[PDB]
Design a protein around this nucleic acid. Structure first.
Ligand SMILES: [Mg+2]
Ligand SMILES: [Mg+2]
Lengths: 57, 49, 241, 119
RNA sequence: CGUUGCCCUCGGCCGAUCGAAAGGGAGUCGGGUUCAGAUCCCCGAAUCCGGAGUGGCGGAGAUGGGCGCCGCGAGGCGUCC
RNA sequence: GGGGGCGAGCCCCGAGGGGCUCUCGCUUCUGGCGCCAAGCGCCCGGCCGCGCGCCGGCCGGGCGCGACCCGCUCCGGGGACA
């Protein structure tokens, strides 16, 4: 509906019950999640490998 | 970009002083694609774009 | 125990491309208003440019201990304020028709103030000491004055602050000051001061005349030259010697 | 020891005072010249107006062109100790602002018309 | 509780302003009515925007669960989240 | 200019360490996140309990480091020629 109508509408009509509800598609959320997680794990792994390299040297 | 042979690229950085995502319009080097990372500065690596 | 398990560290790595930089002080890189920027880089020209000696001599100001002695001595001879002036007149008006009115009594000695009073009583050798402010705004007013004083043999000095010189008298600023006479009790202190001043200014005026003095470079420029000289030094010093 | 966080130097917000005028410029305030009387010039007694009065429960006035509907409403109320439902102005091709005034249903239009003079 | 005065605290913008009765731009429709007016008057159905303080009212927030007593039982109180 | 130190080149070294020189100011596998401070340190106002209260608790604040020090042109590029 035309944007200035949204003003009238109830919250539920304007969004959806999810993280990034009504701003982003479901597909690209669940990728974000697992990207964010799989990225963070590799940072932790690299941090561990760095710490092992410090202990070695 | 009208009246320009070349294509441009909207390239988004993060402003390193305010929490804010600045954006630029580079001239697209050939071989650029979307969802690529573009690195830039003195300690930038020598690849395209 | 008084150490909650939850309380962590969470340290921020202010690297490059890492966590956004902290709000550090930028006073050095501020874009200043044109007035500020101007008044700042005026002082830079006076350092950078080859300043001629008649203007330079106003850098050689009086030292701290001496200055506080001088201003102590003047405190005796601060000229009459308002109200005091009225009381001097009012008392005289009352005494004329009451209990014998002489008229002139005997007036005490005081400071003399602005350049024009001073120069007429350096020409005339009436002054014993001349205090000059270092920071008169269009210098010309006081440029000749130190050359003049030394010609008439009048002890002269350059105090800091045209303001603090002007606070002796009760005005905003004053260019100059001079003692024509001093009371017998305080005469010896003035005489002590006078000799100490003239050794530092009048009795080395030839050196003051010769002494040019700006021509200093920026520290950023200087540092580069010294680094270049250290490169030239290490090119031919550690090799042979 | 108060540091510049930002490289800008905006102007500092100074105190600025209210007026405390040593004398008033104009001696006394201008008396209003758009009163309950000056606002309502006279009633139309035109065939069309009379039909509007009898049937629709209105009155038809020529009004001063500077008037709001709010001012007209207040005026009519004051003059004819009446109460208005709604005011509905237009401007005649002539220069006189006409105002159809719908009177509230408790009151009749014919009765007030007889009171003011027109019929 | 408002209203204002001062003190601190925070604040990028981006150019004052003008520029469209065809661009953008919330929300009104059916019937009736005049010599000449009607999405504008009357009747009837609606609707948007702004206000709504003291909040005008309901409803949501929210009325669980535990333990301890007393009560045949429905339940009542005490106390814990 | 110093700090910092994972380290590399050199110098010293007593193998603990120190100095000079480099190096960073620490981020490159993914179309994520990333501000308004955690942490430590030192102070104070009120309230409560021990009572010696800069002892302990409850509530509420302030400053320092964190985020080195000093400086004279904001940074570059030209330039006594344009
Ligand atoms: Mg929905
Ligand atoms: Mg316009």
């Amino acid at each position: 509906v035309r944007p200035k109508v949204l003003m009238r509408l109830s919250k539920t009509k304007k969004h959806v019950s999810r993280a990034y509800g009504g701003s982003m598609c479901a597909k690209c959320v669940r990728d974000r999640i697992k990207r964010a997680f799989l990225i963070e794990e590799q940072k932790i792994v690299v941090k561990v490998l760095k710490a092992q390299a410090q202990s070695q040297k | 970009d009208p009246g320009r042979g070349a294509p441009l690229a909207k390239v988004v950085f993060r402003d390193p002083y305010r929490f804010k995502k600045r954006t630029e319009l580079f001239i697209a080097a050939e071989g650029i694609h979307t969802g690529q990372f573009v690195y830039c500065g003195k300690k930038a690596q020598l690849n395209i774009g | 125990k008084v150490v909650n398990p939850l309380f962590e560290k969470r340290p921020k790595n202010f690297g490059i491309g890492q966590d956004i930089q902290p709000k550090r002080d930028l006073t050095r890189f501020v874009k200043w208003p044109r007035y500020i920027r101007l008044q700042r880089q005026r002082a830079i020209l006076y350092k950078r440019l080859k300043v001629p000696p008649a203007i330079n001599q106003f850098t050689q100001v009086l030292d701290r201990q001496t200055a506080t002695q001088l201003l102590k001595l003047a405190h005796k001879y601060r000229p009459e304020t308002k109200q005091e002036k009225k009381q001097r007149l009012l008392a005289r008006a009352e005494k004329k028709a009451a209990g014998k009115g002489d008229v002139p009594t005997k007036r005490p000695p005081v400071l003399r103030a602005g350049v024009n009073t001073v120069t007429t009583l350096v020409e005339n050798k009436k002054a014993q000491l001349v205090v000059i402010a270092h920071d008169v705004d269009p210098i010309e007013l006081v440029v000749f004055l130190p050359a003049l004083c030394r010609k008439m043999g009048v002890p002269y000095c350059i105090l800091k602050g045209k303001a603090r010189l002007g606070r002796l008298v009760h005005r905003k600023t004053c260019t100059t000051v001079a003692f024509t006479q001093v009371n017998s009790e305080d005469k010896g202190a003035l005489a002590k001061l006078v000799e100490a001043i003239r050794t530092n200014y009048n009795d080395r005026y030839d050196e003051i005349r010769r002494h040019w003095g700006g021509n200093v470079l920026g520290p950023k420029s200087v540092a580069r030259i010294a680094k270049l000289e250290k490169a030239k030094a290490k090119e031919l010093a550690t090799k042979l010697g | 020891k108060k540091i510049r966080t930002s490289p800008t130097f905006r102007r500092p917000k100074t105190l600025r005072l209210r007026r405390q005028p040593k004398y008033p410029r104009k001696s006394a305030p201008r008396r209003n010249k758009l009163d309950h009387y000056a606002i309502i010039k006279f009633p139309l007694t035109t065939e069309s107006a009379m039909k509007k009065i009898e049937d629709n429960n209105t009155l038809v006035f020529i009004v001063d062109v500077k008037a709001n509907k709010h001012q007209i409403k207040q005026a009519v109320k004051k003059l004819y100790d009446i109460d208005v439902a709604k005011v509905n102005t237009l401007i005649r091709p002539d220069g006189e602002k006409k105002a159809y005034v719908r009177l509230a249903p408790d009151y009749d239009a014919l009765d007030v018309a007889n009171k003011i003079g027109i019929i």
